[PDB]
Design a protein around this nucleic acid. Structure first.
Lengths: 102, 49, 640, 431, 100, 28, 307
RNA sequence: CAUUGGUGAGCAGCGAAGGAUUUGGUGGAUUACUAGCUAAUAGCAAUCUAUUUCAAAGAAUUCAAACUUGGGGGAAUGCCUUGUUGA
């Protein structure tokens, strides 16, 4: 569905240089470094999962494809992701799929 | 290019014996004793209390 | 021979070839340039990344290299390139027909030496100028003055004096005047390699007999001499750390370390590069650091370090022997059979006549690793049968890989040259797999394939038998018997329903695989060397011995297209990612591009070196060829 | 790396720097003689009295310690701490103390050296700073109670990791664990650079120089399987025995014979190496008791190698040198010894060299052969040379008496070599 | 006293103060141009400062039987076991065998 | 226990070279 | 020595000997920390809440107050921890009783630079105006305002005598103030890249940090025009004041720099790690052992902690 | 009689100048490769100093500033806010 380090569920194998003896180097709060006030204010509730706002996670967003349907018309199917609703298709037809060639 | 740095030498200031008391070198420069009036006030204020 | 579809990107998997690498210093960091044939490379020395490759191929091979701080001086046949960041910014042409053997830089001057004992001087046109450009003069050396030029060196603190070392003796030329200010005495041995010293007025010398001769220039005498048994000295370097150390690199693969203070050797390295490909062509202690960089001709480049001494008070006597540090690797031999690993074109397996498979990286060139050959200890408990002096696997002539179930069991099946079995390999762990697949009729494995599900492993024996081994346990499931000659290609369709096979008897048998029934059987004219299936459209192409590609539909069971136009044996071929092209390479030294709708070639590429394998990417972007000479893999960018 | 790895690296460089009082009461409390409670309560001024009084007794035993009272054991050298001084001045404090522990190591059973080095322990911190030359000078006293005290102070270097289980142990470090020290390829490279430093001052004593070889024999013994391990071992051992033969001392030379003979039986060395070793044994061979040991080397060295050119004639510079130091009468008194060692493969190389080089004394070349029962191929390989000599040399009646010894024993051997070269009737016609 | 003399090495006169790096060679602030014999003298002494002189170049040079006969032949060989002989005598404890 | 041989992490310290590019002086 | 990572280290090392007291990994960001009253009790400035730690790494207090802390300082004769964060306010926390003494509205915005005055125990904030402001826990107005430099103030430092101040604005400038009479001595203009940090030695030596550079001057703090620090003397002019000692790091950007008090080094904190540069003229060679012992046992300390 | 339990003696079988378990340290990866440094249209990289300064440009809420506080109740003395007395 996606190749983002920003989202969580992408990598089968994390990098090893992120792992410092006390903990991953992604779990460290960079929030206090930021210049503005509005970034620094962590209002994330403690164990809020899939909650109301994206601020209230204190996690990166998970990768999940929630609901998938085929299209009625044209060999398409849409999968509703975390990144947003994907649409796959065959409207290219750059492909040699012959039938009964002599 | 003559260089001299501060050498404490560790033998004067910490005694050789165990039984000998520590020597306690003093510098009476007022720059290192900053609060002249305030301290001796609150030594007298502890003295009355 | 200009193609319309393809254009070369770079050659993957080459590090060195034998030309001495030359190091340059930026600030406090070090970069190594090497060369690959007609196109040189640049490696960092702190982590051996690839930093810069040249923008164009040179018209001939680079003969000698040197690098002053930003500018890499490359010297092919008649000319000297003065390159920055791999970009040719000034081409300097020498006015002979002779080929340039050696090169040197100091000051305002460049010093290039052709093979016919002639030395050309090129001045900086201005002291503001960075690369020397103007032709100053032509210095010659007649054969009564000295022998053939071994090297050009410029020693420390000599105003325009150029220490020209020859096979007989040592010269000195004041390039401002042009005059021979000093000539040395004649040496009893043929000199092979010279190198300066961090002390004053001393160049080091290397003979064809094993003798290193320290030679002073102010006294003109031999200060020290070091005899070596039975070696042809090929490289010299001095450690400038503050501890006196000489590194003598032989041509028999040995690297030898001395301690000039203690007058002793310290530790001798054995076979750090192959003796046959040239041994240690160049070795160099990096400046002021305990790092020696060895680069042989066998397409490798290794760094060795000295650990600090274990003794507290002694120090310089108890010396740690040198230690392996990082390296880069390529094939020493040309590659026999390659494949692509994944869909994003991110790894390439390459197995060569060096007997060692490599998972090269198209993406980042420091990511390439040899797949290990270290046999898993058996499930069964009885011990593995093999020679205790471990030798590599015999060279690999057929490979198959389906990427669908990777990281859970094996997904690479390789058939070795002249072995009745055919091993398996895990892709993710970079290792030989635990299962080996036998043919059960004592025939050689000529063709292998895997199911798209990654559960079945096909093996095509050279006696007709198609054994189908499972891929969890390596267990035998089914043995198909239709052919009588050698089976030379199997495939399974995308749906795991129908299965094809092609023999040297001409039979193209069409199997069902859900049921075990033979669906049908087709016979063409010639024997059939290879098969490439295309699982997206159920078309597969054959290579015959009447020099024509026959493309057969897998469903309708009949020849759909037949392609004429080759004139010698078709080596390998592959479909496009969309089935719209076939690119085939043959022993007529051509690489054509067939077009399946219209049934004809649309592009014909005459390459002088014959191409052994052609493989598209699963993505529609890259085309990789492997030739007969050369070591690396030529990658073609797709204009389509 | 981590933080606590780097921050313990600062601790090693300030191992002696007394910072708190508790840091001083741990460093100053350890010493050679006094226990941990009575050591911490005494000045350097107290210790210097006992040292300088003891050091004048050692100056009476030998006058070499008189110089250190001018420099290290002087009264002005109480105020100087190591840590205050520059980097060039510390290496001179090491090179005095390294010169001190050579002279100290010999008189180490005696009581005054125990009171002498202790001020050089406790004031100059040699139990932390330079404990290699402290321990290498005193490595031969492992059974004694004085070395058990020396272990109870020293933070052991990374090279002496075999003794690390014997620090503050009850029982002394046993004899095999001393071999596990010398079995390492790096610890030998100290004990070379300790010994070649120790020979240059010509103070190498008898009990020390035994314990060197009694370890250097065993290192060859423990590695008699691994032919790779021995191949990298003799740049360490033979370069000692080369420099150990250069000594003026007769006692050092006999130690070189023990290592040479042991290594030669364990590994067949080349012909050129044995002829190299045989020159250096010959060259510096002066005293009486070094000669007897030296002859049993060449007796044994020539039997270790075996191959083509096993019984070759000696080179010219070798042979007259061997005649210079060993007499042809003295080699005969050697063969008449009732020990009677295997002199077998050497003398048939010795006799052939007589036949080519000197030729004046072939009365001896008969009497050599009566005293030793030779081998079968050796007598044939001798008699070929004499028959070559029979044609070339201006013919002599004593040469005829030599063949009369071979007409006595192995008549067909005389015939078969003549039937290989020349005629049967022509040799008897020649004499 | 050297083995050679360059005649035109004296005639050459180099300005110091142009390049950023060579300005450490000057002895006083007033000098700017130094002839080639003194310039190459000063350029050696800075080359001392970058690479100090080791022991082997200066004090040491190579130029009855001897004592060093055992040290020299150890220097001239790298493999010490007599494998070159084809001895026709069999070595104990290590048997070269190859299974067919 | 035998002598603990452990390779240490090697950092490239800075150094310096005599520049050959200063060794040329102009014509008189 | 106490160090804090911007991400998570807080290490309360003993420094001469190689012992390590406490190493806390905090996954909140951390800006600065000081030891409060001994080596034993220190106080980091976390993401939001200034904590009070112990020698073992224990927490002693989560200060509900002090709700931003970029700049954190202690002054040792009052037991009075002082903070000034990105909130404008200036809070002094009397850490013996735990009772917050005085909370002071600065009115000038986020405190860009704070450093104490040792002679006087007033403190000097630095704002985005460039107005170095002297403060005191009794009066709620600033004692005296000082337009030091244009733009904001990157750092400040105050001489141990109390006479002299050095500010470094972000207008590529640097001022040398006289705090006894509130008159600037002389102004370094157009140093090539703005000095992020300064510090004053004990002997009176000045420090400066262009970010990869560390530059030192001797006799900068005096009153003559010849004492005006300069990057270079034309013609070797003796009245012009060359820099005393310079050092530049390779690829770092320093964060603070403080001299060691009773030796002569300066502790430089850069992005990769820590060096101590050896400076001969820096520290005072002869302390007063009633006041501050470099050589101080356990019993001599905890009796002087009560005193 | 059954062990799906522990120890320990043996054999078949697998078996190229040995085999198995466990672990210290370093290197190469773990995202897609355009070189180091600084005062950066250039210089260094053996060094920026006896060119490193002058000139220029550069000063808003006429003195906006806790979007940051666990909840009840209080706040004498503080502080804030407004009002006022006096100079």
């Amino acid at each position: 569905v996606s190749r983002n380090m920003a989202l969580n569920g992408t990598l089968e194998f994390l990098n090893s240089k992120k792992m410092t003896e006390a903990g991953s180097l992604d779990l460290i709060d960079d929030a206090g470094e930021n210049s503005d006030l509005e970034d620094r204010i962590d209002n994330s509730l403690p164990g809020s999962q899939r909650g109301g706002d994206l601020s209230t996670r204190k996690m990166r967003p998970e990768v999940r494809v929630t609901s998938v349907q085929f299209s009625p018309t044209a060999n398409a199917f849409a999968a509703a992701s975390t990144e947003g609703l994907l649409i796959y298709s065959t409207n290219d037809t750059i492909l040699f799929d012959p039938f009964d060639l002599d | 290019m003559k260089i001299k740095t501060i050498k404490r030498s560790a033998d004067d200031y910490v005694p050789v014996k165990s039984t000998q008391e520590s020597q306690m070198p003093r510098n009476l420069n007022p720059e290192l004793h900053p609060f002249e009036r305030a301290r001796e006030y609150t030594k007298a204020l502890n003295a009355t209390k | 021979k200009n193609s319309k579809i393809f254009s070369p990107f770079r050659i993957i998997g080459n590090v060195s070839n034998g030309v001495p690498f030359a190091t340059g210093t930026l600030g406090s960091t070090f970069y190594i340039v090497t060369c690959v044939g007609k196109t040189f490379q640049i490696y960092d020395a702190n982590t051996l990344h690839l930093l810069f490759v040249s923008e164009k191929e040179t018209p001939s091979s680079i003969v000698a290299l040197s690098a002053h701080f930003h500018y890499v001086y490359a010297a092919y046949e008649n000319k000297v390139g003065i390159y920055k960041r791999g970009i040719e910014e000034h081409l300097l042409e020498l006015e002979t027909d002779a080929n340039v053997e050696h090169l040197c830089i100091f000051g305002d001057y460049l010093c290039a030496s052709t093979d016919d004992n002639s030395i050309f001087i090129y001045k900086k046109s201005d002291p503001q100028d960075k690369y020397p450009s103007e032709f100053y003069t032509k210095l010659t050396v007649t054969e009564i003055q000295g022998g053939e030029i071994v090297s050009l060196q410029h020693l420390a603190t000599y105003l325009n004096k150029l220490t020209v070392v020859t096979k007989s003796n040592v010269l000195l030329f004041n390039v401002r005047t042009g005059k021979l200010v000093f000539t040395s005495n004649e040496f009893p041995d043929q000199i092979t390699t010279a190198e300066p010293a961090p002390v004053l007025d001393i160049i080091a010398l290397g003979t064809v007999t094993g003798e290193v001769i320290m030679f002073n220039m102010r006294k003109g005498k031999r200060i020290r001499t070091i005899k070596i048994p039975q070696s042809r000295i090929s490289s010299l370097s001095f450690r400038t750390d503050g501890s006196s150390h000489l590194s003598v690199g032989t041509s028999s693969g040995d690297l030898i370390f001395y301690d000039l203070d203690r007058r002793s050797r310290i530790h001798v390295l054995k076979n750090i590069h192959r003796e046959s490909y040239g041994g240690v062509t160049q070795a160099t202690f990096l400046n002021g650091q305990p790092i020696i960089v060895t680069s042989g001709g066998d397409n490798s480049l290794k760094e060795y370090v000295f650990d600090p001494s274990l003794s507290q008070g002694s120090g310089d006597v108890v010396v740690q022997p040198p230690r392996y540090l990082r390296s880069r690797g390529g094939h020493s031999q040309p590659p026999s059979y390659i494949a692509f690993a994944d869909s994003q074109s991110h790894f390439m397996l390459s197995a060569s006549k060096d007997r060692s498979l490599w998972s090269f990286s198209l993406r980042k060139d420091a990511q390439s690793q040899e797949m290990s050959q270290r046999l898993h200890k058996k499930q069964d408990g009885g011990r593995v049968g093999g020679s205790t002096i471990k030798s590599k696997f015999p060279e690999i002539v057929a490979l198959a890989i389906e990427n669908a179930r990777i990281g859970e069991w094996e997904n690479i099946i390789t058939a070795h040259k002249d072995e009745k079995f055919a091993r398996t390999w895990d892709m993710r762990n970079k290792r030989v797999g635990r299962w080996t697949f036998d043919t059960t009729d004592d025939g050689f494995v000529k063709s292998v394939a895997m199911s798209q599900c990654g559960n079945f492993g096909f093996i095509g024996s050279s006696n007709g038998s198609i054994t189908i081994y499972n891929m969890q346990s390596g267990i035998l499931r089914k043995k198909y018997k239709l052919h009588k000659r050698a089976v030379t290609g199997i495939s399974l369709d995308g749906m795991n329903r129908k299965m094809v096979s092609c023999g040297l008897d001409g039979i193209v048998g069409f199997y069902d695989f859900n049921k075990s029934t033979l669906l049908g059987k087709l016979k063409l004219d010639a024997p059939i060397t290879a098969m490439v299936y295309h699982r997206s459209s159920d078309l597969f192409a054959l290579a015959l011995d009447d020099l024509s590609i026959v493309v057969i539909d897998a469903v309708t069971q009949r020849v759909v297209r037949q392609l004429w136009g080759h004139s010698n044996r078709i080596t390998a071929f592959d479909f496009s990612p969309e089935g719209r092209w076939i690119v085939s390479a043959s022993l007529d030294s051509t690489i054509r591009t067939w077009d399946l709708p219209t049934g004809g070639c649309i592009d014909g590429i005459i390459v002088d070196n014959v191409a052994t394998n052609v493989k598209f990417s699963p993505n529609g972007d890259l085309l990789a060829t492997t030739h007969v000479t050369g070591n690396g893999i030529c990658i073609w960018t797709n204009r389509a | 790396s981590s933080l606590s790895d780097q921050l313990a690296q600062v601790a090693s460089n300030n191992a002696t720097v007394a910072l708190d009082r508790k840091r001083r009461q741990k460093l100053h409390s350890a010493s050679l003689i006094y226990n941990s409670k009575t050591a911490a309560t005494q000045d350097y001024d107290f210790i210097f009295e006992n040292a300088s009084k003891a050091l004048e007794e050692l100056s009476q035993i030998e006058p070499k310690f008189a110089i250190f009272s001018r420099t290290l054991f002087s009264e002005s050298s109480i105020s100087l701490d190591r840590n205050v001084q520059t980097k060039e001045e510390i290496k001179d404090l090491d090179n005095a103390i390294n010169a001190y522990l050579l002279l100290a190591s010999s008189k180490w059973y005696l009581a005054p050296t125990l009171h002498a080095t202790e001020w050089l322990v406790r004031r100059f911190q040699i139990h932390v700073k330079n404990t290699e030359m402290l321990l290498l000078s005193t490595l031969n006293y492992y059974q004694t109670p004085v070395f058990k005290r020396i272990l109870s102070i020293i933070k052991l270097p990374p090279l002496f990791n075999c003794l690390s289980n014997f620090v503050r142990s009850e029982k002394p470090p046993t004899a095999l664990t001393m071999i596990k020290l010398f079995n390492d390829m790096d610890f030998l490279k100290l004990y070379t650079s300790y010994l070649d430093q120790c020979i240059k001052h010509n103070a190498t004593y008898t009990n020390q120089l035994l314990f060197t070889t009694c370890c250097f024999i065993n290192v060859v013994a423990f590695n008699s399987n691994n032919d790779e391990k021995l191949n990298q071992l003799v740049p360490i051992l033979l370069e000692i025995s080369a420099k150990l033969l250069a000594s003026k001392s007769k006692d050092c030379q006999i130690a070189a014979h023990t290592i040479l003979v042991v290594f030669a039986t364990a590994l067949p060395l080349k012909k050129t190496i044995i002829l190299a070793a045989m020159e250096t044994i010959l060259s510096n061979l002066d005293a009486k008791e070094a000669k007897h040991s030296a002859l049993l080397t060449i007796c044994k060295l020539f039997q270790t190698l075996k191959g083509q050119g096993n019984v070759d004639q000696l080179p010219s510079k070798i042979f007259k040198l061997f005649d210079s130091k060993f007499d042809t009468v003295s080699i005969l008194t050697f063969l008449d010894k009732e020990d009677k060692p295997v002199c077998d493969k050497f003398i048939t190389s010795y006799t052939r060299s007589i036949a080519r080089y000197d030729r004046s004394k072939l009365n001896i070349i008969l009497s050599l052969l009566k005293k030793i029962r030779l081998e079968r191929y050796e007598v044939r390989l001798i008699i070929t040379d004499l028959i070559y000599l029979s044609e070339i040399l201006e013919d002599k009646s004593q040469l005829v008496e030599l063949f009369e010894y071979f007409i006595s024993i192995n008549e067909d051997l005389v015939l078969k070599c003549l039937k290989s070269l020349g005629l049967t009737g022509x040799x008897x016609x020649x004499x | 006293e050297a083995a050679w003399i360059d005649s035109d090495d004296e005639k050459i006169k180099v300005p110091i103060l142009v390049t950023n790096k060579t300005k450490k060679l000057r002895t006083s602030y007033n000098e700017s141009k130094i002839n080639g014999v003194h310039y190459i003298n000063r350029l050696r002494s800075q080359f001392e400062k970058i690479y100090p002189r080791p022991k082997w170049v200066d004090d040491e040079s190579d130029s009855n039987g001897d004592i060093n006969a055992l040290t020299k032949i150890l220097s001239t060989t790298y493999n010490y076991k007599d494998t070159l002989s084809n001895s026709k005598l069999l070595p104990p404890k290590k048997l070269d065998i190859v299974r067919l | 226990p035998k002598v603990v041989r452990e390779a240490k992490k090697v950092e490239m310290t800075e150094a310096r070279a005599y520049n050959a590019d200063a060794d040329t002086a102009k014509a008189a | 020595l106490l160090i804090t990572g911007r991400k998570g280290h807080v290490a309360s090392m003993d420094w001469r000997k190689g012992q390590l007291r406490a190493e806390l990994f905090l996954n909140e960001t951390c800006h600065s920390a000081t030891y409060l009253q001994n080596e034993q009790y220190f106080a980091v400035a976390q993401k939001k809440y200034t904590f009070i730690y112990d020698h073992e790494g224990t927490e002693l207090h989560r200060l509900k107050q002090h709700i931003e802390a970029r700049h954190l300082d202690f002054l040792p004769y009052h037991y009075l921890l002082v903070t000034a964060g990105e909130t404008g306010w200036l809070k002094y926390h009397d850490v013996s009783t735990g009772q917050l003494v005085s909370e002071l509205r600065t009115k000038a915005g986020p405190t860009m630079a704070m450093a104490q005055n040792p002679w006087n125990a007033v403190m000097h904030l630095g704002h985005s105006n460039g107005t170095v402001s002297l403060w005191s826990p009794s009066m709620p107005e600033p004692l005296v305002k000082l337009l030091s430099a244009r733009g904001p103030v990157n750092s400040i430092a105050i001489d141990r005598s109390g006479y002299y101040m050095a500010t470094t604005g972000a207008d590529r400038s640097m001022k040398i103030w006289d705090i006894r009479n509130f008159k600037q001595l002389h102004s370094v203009e157009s140093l090539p890249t703005p000095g992020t940090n300064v510090s004053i030695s004990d002997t009176g030596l000045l420090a400066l940090s262009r970010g990869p550079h560390v530059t030192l001057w001797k006799d900068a703090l005096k009153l003559s025009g010849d004492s005006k620090p300069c990057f270079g003397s034309m013609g070797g002019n003796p009245h012009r004041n060359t820099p005393y000692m310079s050092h530049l790091f390779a690829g770092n950007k320093v964060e603070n720099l403080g001299f060691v008090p009773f030796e002569d080094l300066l502790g430089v904190g850069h992005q990769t790690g820590i060096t101590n540069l050896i400076v001969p003229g820096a520290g005072e060679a002869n302390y007063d052992a009633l006041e501050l012992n470099p050589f101080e046992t356990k019993k001599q300390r905890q009796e002087q902690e009560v005193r």
